[PDB]
Short mmCIF file of C-alpha atoms in Angstrom, two decimals:
data_model
loop_
_atom_site.label_atom_id
_atom_site.label_comp_id
_atom_site.label_asym_id
_atom_site.label_seq_id
_atom_site.Cartn_x
_atom_site.Cartn_y
_atom_site.Cartn_z
CA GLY A 1 15.91 12.09 -1.64
CA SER A 2 14.60 10.89 1.67
CA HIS A 3 13.97 7.19 2.39
CA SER A 4 12.07 5.05 4.85
CA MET A 5 11.92 1.58 6.29
CA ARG A 6 8.48 0.53 7.52
CA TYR A 7 6.89 -2.62 8.85
CA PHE A 8 3.18 -3.27 8.75
CA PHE A 9 1.46 -5.95 10.84
CA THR A 10 -2.11 -7.16 10.79
CA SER A 11 -3.68 -9.75 13.10
CA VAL A 12 -7.28 -10.85 12.75
CA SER A 13 -8.89 -13.02 15.40
CA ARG A 14 -10.60 -16.27 14.51
CA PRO A 15 -13.30 -16.99 17.06
CA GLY A 16 -14.56 -20.12 15.38
CA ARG A 17 -11.29 -22.03 15.57
CA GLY A 18 -7.67 -21.45 16.06
CA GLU A 19 -5.12 -18.59 16.18
CA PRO A 20 -5.36 -15.18 14.65
CA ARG A 21 -4.36 -14.74 11.03
CA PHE A 22 -1.10 -12.70 11.12
CA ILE A 23 0.46 -10.99 8.17
CA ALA A 24 3.65 -8.88 8.35
CA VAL A 25 5.19 -6.94 5.45
CA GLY A 26 8.36 -4.83 5.37
CA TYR A 27 9.08 -1.97 2.93
CA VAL A 28 11.98 0.24 1.99
CA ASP A 29 10.34 3.25 0.41
CA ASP A 30 7.64 1.85 -1.92
CA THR A 31 9.41 -1.53 -2.30
CA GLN A 32 8.17 -4.56 -0.33
CA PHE A 33 11.13 -6.69 0.70
CA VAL A 34 9.93 -9.28 3.24
CA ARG A 35 6.69 -11.02 4.28
CA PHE A 36 5.46 -13.35 6.98
CA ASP A 37 2.04 -15.03 6.79
CA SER A 38 1.04 -17.33 9.63
CA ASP A 39 -0.98 -19.39 7.11
CA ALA A 40 1.97 -20.03 4.76
CA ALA A 41 3.77 -23.37 4.96
CA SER A 42 7.28 -22.08 5.52
CA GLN A 43 6.62 -20.49 8.94
CA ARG A 44 9.59 -18.27 8.00
CA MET A 45 10.17 -14.65 7.16
CA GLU A 46 10.28 -14.72 3.31
CA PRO A 47 12.16 -12.47 0.82
CA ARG A 48 10.09 -10.35 -1.58
CA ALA A 49 12.91 -8.37 -3.25
CA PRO A 50 16.10 -9.72 -4.75
CA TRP A 51 18.51 -7.58 -2.83
CA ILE A 52 17.41 -9.09 0.51
CA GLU A 53 18.18 -12.70 -0.67
CA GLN A 54 21.84 -12.18 -0.03
CA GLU A 55 21.30 -11.98 3.72
CA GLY A 56 22.52 -15.07 5.44
CA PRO A 57 20.83 -17.67 7.56
CA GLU A 58 21.62 -15.77 10.75
CA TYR A 59 19.50 -12.88 9.38
CA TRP A 60 16.53 -15.05 8.34
CA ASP A 61 16.51 -16.98 11.58
CA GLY A 62 16.50 -13.76 13.61
CA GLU A 63 13.82 -12.13 11.54
CA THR A 64 11.70 -15.26 11.81
CA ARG A 65 12.09 -15.36 15.60
CA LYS A 66 11.25 -11.69 15.93
CA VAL A 67 8.27 -11.77 13.63
CA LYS A 68 6.77 -14.76 15.48
CA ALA A 69 7.20 -12.86 18.72
CA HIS A 70 5.34 -9.97 17.27
CA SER A 71 2.50 -12.33 16.27
CA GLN A 72 2.28 -13.66 19.86
CA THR A 73 2.08 -10.16 21.29
CA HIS A 74 -0.73 -9.31 18.92
CA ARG A 75 -2.55 -12.53 19.90
CA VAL A 76 -2.38 -11.52 23.55
CA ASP A 77 -3.46 -8.01 22.73
CA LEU A 78 -6.53 -9.20 20.87
CA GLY A 79 -7.66 -10.94 24.05
CA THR A 80 -6.94 -8.01 26.29
CA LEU A 81 -8.61 -5.52 23.95
CA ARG A 82 -11.74 -7.68 23.72
CA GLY A 83 -12.03 -7.31 27.50
CA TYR A 84 -11.13 -3.60 27.64
CA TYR A 85 -13.95 -2.89 25.14
CA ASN A 86 -16.40 -5.36 26.77
CA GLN A 87 -16.82 -7.31 23.57
CA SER A 88 -18.17 -10.79 23.00
CA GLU A 89 -15.96 -13.80 22.26
CA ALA A 90 -18.04 -14.37 19.17
CA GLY A 91 -16.71 -11.68 16.89
CA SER A 92 -13.52 -11.31 14.89
CA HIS A 93 -11.40 -8.29 15.62
CA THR A 94 -8.27 -6.72 14.17
CA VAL A 95 -5.00 -5.30 15.59
CA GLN A 96 -2.72 -3.29 13.22
CA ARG A 97 0.77 -1.99 13.99
CA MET A 98 3.11 0.10 11.82
CA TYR A 99 6.56 1.28 12.82
CA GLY A 100 9.71 2.48 11.11
CA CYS A 101 12.10 5.30 10.44
CA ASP A 102 12.71 7.99 7.87
CA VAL A 103 16.12 9.32 6.81
CA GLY A 104 16.83 12.49 4.82
CA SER A 105 18.70 12.77 1.57
CA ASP A 106 21.79 12.70 3.73
CA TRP A 107 20.73 9.20 4.91
CA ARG A 108 20.66 10.40 8.52
CA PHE A 109 17.79 10.02 10.96
CA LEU A 110 14.82 12.29 10.30
CA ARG A 111 11.90 10.76 12.24
CA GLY A 112 10.58 7.59 13.76
CA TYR A 113 7.10 6.23 14.39
CA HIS A 114 5.26 3.39 16.07
CA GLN A 115 1.46 3.30 15.82
CA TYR A 116 -1.19 0.79 16.89
CA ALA A 117 -4.87 0.46 15.96
CA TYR A 118 -7.74 -1.67 17.15
CA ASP A 119 -10.57 -2.44 14.77
CA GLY A 120 -9.26 0.12 12.31
CA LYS A 121 -9.12 3.07 14.72
CA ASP A 122 -6.17 4.68 16.50
CA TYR A 123 -5.34 3.10 19.83
CA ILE A 124 -1.92 4.33 20.92
CA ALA A 125 1.03 5.87 19.05
CA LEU A 126 4.49 7.17 19.90
CA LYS A 127 4.79 10.98 19.66
CA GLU A 128 7.33 12.51 17.29
CA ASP A 129 9.78 13.02 20.18
CA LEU A 130 9.85 9.26 20.72
CA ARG A 131 9.54 9.88 24.44
CA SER A 132 5.74 10.10 24.98
CA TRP A 133 2.53 8.52 23.71
CA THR A 134 -0.75 9.59 22.26
CA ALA A 135 -3.66 7.41 23.68
CA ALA A 136 -6.97 7.82 21.86
CA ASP A 137 -9.36 6.75 24.61
CA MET A 138 -9.34 5.62 28.28
CA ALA A 139 -8.42 2.04 27.42
CA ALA A 140 -5.32 3.18 25.61
CA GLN A 141 -4.69 5.62 28.47
CA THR A 142 -4.24 2.61 30.79
CA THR A 143 -1.78 1.17 28.20
CA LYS A 144 0.07 4.48 28.11
CA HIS A 145 0.52 4.53 31.89
CA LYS A 146 1.76 0.91 31.81
CA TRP A 147 4.21 1.58 29.02
CA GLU A 148 5.51 4.75 30.62
CA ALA A 149 6.16 2.93 33.92
CA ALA A 150 8.03 0.19 32.00
CA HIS A 151 10.09 2.73 29.96
CA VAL A 152 9.08 1.25 26.66
CA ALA A 153 9.55 4.48 24.61
CA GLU A 154 13.31 4.48 25.51
CA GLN A 155 13.82 1.00 24.05
CA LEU A 156 11.84 1.80 20.90
CA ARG A 157 13.66 5.11 20.51
CA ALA A 158 17.03 3.28 20.54
CA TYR A 159 15.76 1.05 17.68
CA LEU A 160 14.09 3.81 15.66
CA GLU A 161 17.01 6.30 15.83
CA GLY A 162 19.77 3.71 15.65
CA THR A 163 19.26 0.17 14.42
CA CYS A 164 16.45 1.01 12.06
CA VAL A 165 18.57 3.67 10.36
CA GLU A 166 21.62 1.46 10.17
CA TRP A 167 19.73 -1.34 8.45
CA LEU A 168 17.84 1.00 6.15
CA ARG A 169 21.20 2.31 4.95
CA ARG A 170 22.53 -1.24 4.46
CA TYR A 171 19.48 -2.09 2.32
CA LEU A 172 19.77 1.14 0.31
CA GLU A 173 23.35 0.29 -0.51
CA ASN A 174 22.71 -3.40 -1.23
CA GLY A 175 19.58 -2.72 -3.33
CA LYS A 176 21.18 0.38 -5.00
CA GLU A 177 20.36 -0.59 -8.58
CA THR A 178 16.61 -0.32 -7.85
CA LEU A 179 16.18 1.39 -4.51
CA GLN A 180 18.27 4.43 -5.57
CA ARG A 181 16.81 4.55 -9.07
CA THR A 182 14.08 6.90 -9.86
CA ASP A 183 11.68 5.86 -12.68
CA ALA A 184 10.12 9.01 -14.09
CA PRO A 185 6.58 8.73 -15.37
CA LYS A 186 6.12 7.71 -19.00
CA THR A 187 3.44 10.16 -20.03
CA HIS A 188 0.94 10.56 -22.83
CA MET A 189 -2.47 12.03 -23.48
CA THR A 190 -5.57 10.41 -25.00
CA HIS A 191 -8.66 12.04 -26.45
CA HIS A 192 -12.26 10.74 -26.36
CA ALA A 193 -15.22 12.60 -27.98
CA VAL A 194 -18.30 12.25 -25.81
CA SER A 195 -20.53 14.24 -28.14
CA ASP A 196 -19.94 16.48 -31.11
CA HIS A 197 -19.35 19.31 -28.65
CA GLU A 198 -17.36 18.00 -25.68
CA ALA A 199 -14.31 15.83 -25.39
CA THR A 200 -12.36 14.24 -22.58
CA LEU A 201 -8.58 14.60 -22.42
CA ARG A 202 -6.84 11.99 -20.24
CA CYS A 203 -3.29 12.58 -19.03
CA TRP A 204 -1.48 9.31 -18.24
CA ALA A 205 1.51 8.70 -15.99
CA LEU A 206 2.82 5.15 -16.31
CA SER A 207 5.57 2.94 -14.95
CA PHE A 208 6.88 5.35 -12.30
CA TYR A 209 8.66 4.91 -8.99
CA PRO A 210 8.33 6.09 -6.28
CA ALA A 211 4.56 6.27 -6.04
CA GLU A 212 4.35 9.95 -5.01
CA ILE A 213 3.20 12.04 -8.01
CA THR A 214 1.11 15.14 -8.75
CA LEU A 215 -1.01 15.48 -11.92
CA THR A 216 -2.71 18.91 -12.37
CA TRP A 217 -4.78 20.33 -15.20
CA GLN A 218 -4.63 23.98 -16.22
CA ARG A 219 -6.75 26.01 -18.58
CA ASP A 220 -4.95 29.01 -20.11
CA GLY A 221 -2.30 28.58 -17.41
CA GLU A 222 -4.68 28.46 -14.42
CA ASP A 223 -5.33 25.33 -12.31
CA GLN A 224 -8.67 23.73 -13.07
CA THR A 225 -10.39 21.18 -10.85
CA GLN A 226 -14.01 21.46 -12.06
CA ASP A 227 -14.82 19.10 -14.89
CA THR A 228 -11.85 16.91 -13.90
CA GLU A 229 -11.36 13.40 -12.56
CA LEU A 230 -8.17 11.96 -10.89
CA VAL A 231 -7.84 8.21 -10.08
CA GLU A 232 -6.01 6.98 -7.04
CA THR A 233 -2.40 5.98 -7.77
CA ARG A 234 -2.34 2.24 -8.40
CA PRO A 235 0.29 -0.50 -8.66
CA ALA A 236 1.27 -1.88 -12.04
CA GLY A 237 2.37 -5.10 -10.45
CA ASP A 238 6.00 -4.89 -11.54
CA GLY A 239 6.98 -2.53 -8.73
CA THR A 240 5.97 0.63 -10.54
CA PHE A 241 2.89 2.80 -10.35
CA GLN A 242 0.24 4.31 -12.57
CA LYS A 243 -2.11 7.35 -12.43
CA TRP A 244 -4.26 9.40 -14.73
CA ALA A 245 -6.13 12.70 -14.62
CA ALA A 246 -8.84 13.75 -17.05
CA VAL A 247 -10.65 16.92 -18.00
CA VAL A 248 -13.82 17.55 -20.06
CA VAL A 249 -13.40 20.42 -22.54
CA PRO A 250 -15.36 22.03 -25.35
CA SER A 251 -14.48 20.33 -28.62
CA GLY A 252 -12.07 22.50 -30.51
CA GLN A 253 -10.61 24.10 -27.38
CA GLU A 254 -8.26 21.24 -26.43
CA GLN A 255 -5.16 23.33 -26.96
CA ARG A 256 -6.05 25.67 -23.99
CA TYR A 257 -5.52 22.83 -21.53
CA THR A 258 -2.25 21.55 -20.12
CA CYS A 259 -1.45 18.64 -17.91
CA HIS A 260 1.37 19.17 -15.42
CA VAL A 261 3.29 16.23 -14.03
CA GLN A 262 5.51 16.45 -10.93
CA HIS A 263 7.63 13.54 -9.74
CA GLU A 264 11.01 13.00 -7.98
CA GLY A 265 12.31 11.43 -11.25
CA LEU A 266 11.72 14.64 -13.24
CA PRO A 267 14.35 17.42 -12.92
CA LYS A 268 11.56 19.83 -13.92
CA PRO A 269 7.85 19.15 -14.16
CA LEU A 270 6.49 18.01 -17.52
CA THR A 271 3.75 19.87 -19.32
CA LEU A 272 1.58 17.98 -21.85
CA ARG A 273 -0.78 19.63 -24.37
CA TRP A 274 -3.09 18.23 -27.08
CA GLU A 275 -1.78 19.21 -30.39
CA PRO A 276 -1.03 15.37 -30.63
CA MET B 1 -16.92 -0.70 14.52
CA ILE B 2 -16.29 1.17 11.24
CA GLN B 3 -16.80 -0.92 8.10
CA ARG B 4 -15.37 0.74 5.00
CA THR B 5 -16.25 -0.53 1.55
CA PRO B 6 -13.61 -1.28 -1.07
CA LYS B 7 -12.65 1.00 -3.91
CA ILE B 8 -11.96 -0.97 -7.01
CA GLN B 9 -9.87 -0.32 -10.16
CA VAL B 10 -9.53 -2.83 -13.02
CA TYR B 11 -6.78 -2.24 -15.50
CA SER B 12 -3.94 -3.76 -17.50
CA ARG B 13 -0.35 -3.52 -16.55
CA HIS B 14 0.65 -2.53 -20.11
CA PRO B 15 -1.31 -0.72 -22.76
CA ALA B 16 -3.63 -3.32 -24.19
CA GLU B 17 -3.03 -4.69 -27.68
CA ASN B 18 -5.09 -7.57 -29.04
CA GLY B 19 -3.10 -10.86 -29.09
CA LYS B 20 -0.26 -9.60 -26.96
CA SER B 21 0.21 -11.10 -23.56
CA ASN B 22 -0.28 -8.73 -20.57
CA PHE B 23 -1.44 -8.68 -16.94
CA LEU B 24 -4.99 -7.93 -15.73
CA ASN B 25 -5.07 -6.14 -12.38
CA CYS B 26 -7.86 -5.55 -9.89
CA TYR B 27 -6.76 -3.18 -7.19
CA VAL B 28 -9.00 -3.08 -4.15
CA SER B 29 -8.28 -0.44 -1.47
CA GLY B 30 -9.78 1.62 1.29
CA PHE B 31 -11.56 -1.29 2.99
CA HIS B 32 -11.94 -2.52 6.54
CA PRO B 33 -12.05 -5.27 7.79
CA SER B 34 -9.50 -7.09 5.73
CA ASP B 35 -11.38 -10.25 4.82
CA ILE B 36 -12.43 -9.81 1.19
CA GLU B 37 -13.23 -12.02 -1.82
CA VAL B 38 -11.93 -11.05 -5.22
CA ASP B 39 -12.26 -12.87 -8.53
CA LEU B 40 -11.14 -11.88 -12.01
CA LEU B 41 -13.66 -12.87 -14.73
CA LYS B 42 -13.30 -13.63 -18.41
CA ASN B 43 -16.68 -13.44 -20.20
CA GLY B 44 -18.35 -13.79 -16.82
CA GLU B 45 -16.46 -16.96 -15.79
CA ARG B 46 -13.98 -17.05 -12.96
CA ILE B 47 -10.25 -17.13 -13.89
CA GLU B 48 -8.29 -19.76 -12.03
CA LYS B 49 -4.59 -19.10 -11.07
CA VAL B 50 -5.14 -15.48 -9.96
CA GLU B 51 -2.49 -14.24 -7.55
CA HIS B 52 -2.54 -11.43 -5.04
CA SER B 53 -0.16 -9.18 -3.12
CA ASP B 54 0.51 -9.46 0.59
CA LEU B 55 -1.96 -7.56 2.78
CA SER B 56 -0.92 -4.08 3.74
CA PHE B 57 -2.63 -0.87 4.80
CA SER B 58 -2.63 2.85 4.36
CA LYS B 59 -2.23 5.81 6.64
CA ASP B 60 -5.90 5.72 7.66
CA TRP B 61 -5.56 1.96 8.55
CA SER B 62 -7.63 0.82 5.53
CA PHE B 63 -6.40 -2.20 3.60
CA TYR B 64 -5.29 -2.67 0.06
CA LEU B 65 -4.58 -5.68 -2.19
CA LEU B 66 -3.68 -6.22 -5.84
CA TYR B 67 -5.12 -9.27 -7.57
CA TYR B 68 -3.69 -10.14 -10.95
CA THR B 69 -3.29 -12.66 -13.66
CA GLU B 70 -1.59 -13.03 -17.07
CA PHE B 71 -4.02 -12.61 -19.91
CA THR B 72 -4.11 -12.00 -23.62
CA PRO B 73 -6.68 -9.41 -24.52
CA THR B 74 -8.74 -9.60 -27.68
CA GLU B 75 -11.30 -7.50 -29.46
CA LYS B 76 -14.19 -9.72 -28.25
CA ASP B 77 -13.32 -11.03 -24.80
CA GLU B 78 -14.59 -9.08 -21.83
CA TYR B 79 -12.90 -8.97 -18.47
CA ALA B 80 -14.01 -7.85 -15.04
CA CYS B 81 -13.32 -7.95 -11.35
CA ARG B 82 -15.89 -9.22 -8.88
CA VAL B 83 -15.65 -8.23 -5.26
CA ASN B 84 -17.44 -9.28 -2.09
CA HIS B 85 -16.99 -7.80 1.31
CA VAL B 86 -19.04 -7.55 4.52
CA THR B 87 -20.05 -4.01 3.36
CA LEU B 88 -21.65 -5.34 0.14
CA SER B 89 -25.07 -6.95 0.12
CA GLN B 90 -24.23 -8.46 -3.35
CA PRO B 91 -20.86 -8.96 -5.11
CA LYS B 92 -19.81 -5.88 -7.05
CA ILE B 93 -18.64 -6.35 -10.63
CA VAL B 94 -16.44 -3.78 -12.29
CA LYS B 95 -15.77 -4.31 -16.04
CA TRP B 96 -12.29 -3.67 -17.49
CA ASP B 97 -12.11 -0.62 -19.77
CA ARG B 98 -8.75 -0.53 -21.63
CA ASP B 99 -8.70 3.30 -21.60
CA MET B 100 -9.00 3.67 -17.81
CA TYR C 1 15.51 -5.53 10.23
CA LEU C 2 12.65 -5.90 12.75
CA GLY C 3 12.48 -4.45 16.14
CA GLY C 4 12.67 -6.68 19.15
CA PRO C 5 13.24 -8.97 20.54
CA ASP C 6 10.65 -7.78 23.14
CA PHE C 7 7.49 -5.71 22.46
CA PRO C 8 5.31 -5.45 25.49
CA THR C 9 1.70 -6.28 25.41
CA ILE C 10 -1.18 -3.67 25.63
#
């Protein structure tokens, strides 16, 4: 299947005292592999997956230098943005940045992205061609003109089409035992009688990876959304994910209903039915 | 700007069985800004030693965090997650239900 | 592997 490498950065200003809180995380697919937190003691980029621990000191030093540089740029940006938006020095504000690359099943470049937000709203983002920018408002439009004059998209494009892909492939190979493993959902259904006349069937999907999944209910072979509830996919904490979907049915008619589970780890979708 | 209130799920890592060690999770998501207070509670009292994931965010820029601790469920003990955020005028408590 | 070493400011 396809894969991605993505970095997420958050900086939150601290008007009362000191520097912004800065947190950076890096992911391959749904697996976190590095972190930086400006409040942690190490002041280093830190491994979060075993397969990254084999990189050598040259790697960690470079990632630490780069991540600190990113934090400094976000600190500057917080100041500049506070002035662009005519805001007080009293309030805390947030900059978020995400960038990375996707590869196809062939492990060749599919798409790149680089997006920036201020106070939780789009500010500026690279277009899919990696040559042009989308500015959300007139402040970001001044940024776009600056960045176009400085040819920043060309430098980012070189990273996103080239370096990013090369390193993603290295990590996929080095972390093969997990990163190339698909953990199909472990499924079951539970039954709960609300009254003598209606019952809730809950379809569980447990311990799966990657996080993408679809759970559908059908009645007599037709999709049913009324009388259903679907929770947001959630982390188990061990690197896998969980989800459930439930339907309310007339007691005695449970066997009409089927739960359909689609996931990359399943050669064909699973169908569950209460006749337990 | 936009303030978005946290969604909250409280659940075990593994199917719960009385006397068997497990992990209690409180997953908070969909919130902005990122500052948030989260406690896990046993019979109303705060659990010490709770850990959390590194801050990250979703496609719509909202944040998410997992808070968790080892625990050993029993028939009697009750567990919950308590959350405060700038969007909440009081902390929000969500009780653990082993079937959700 | 992060981008860098330069990322201009806004």
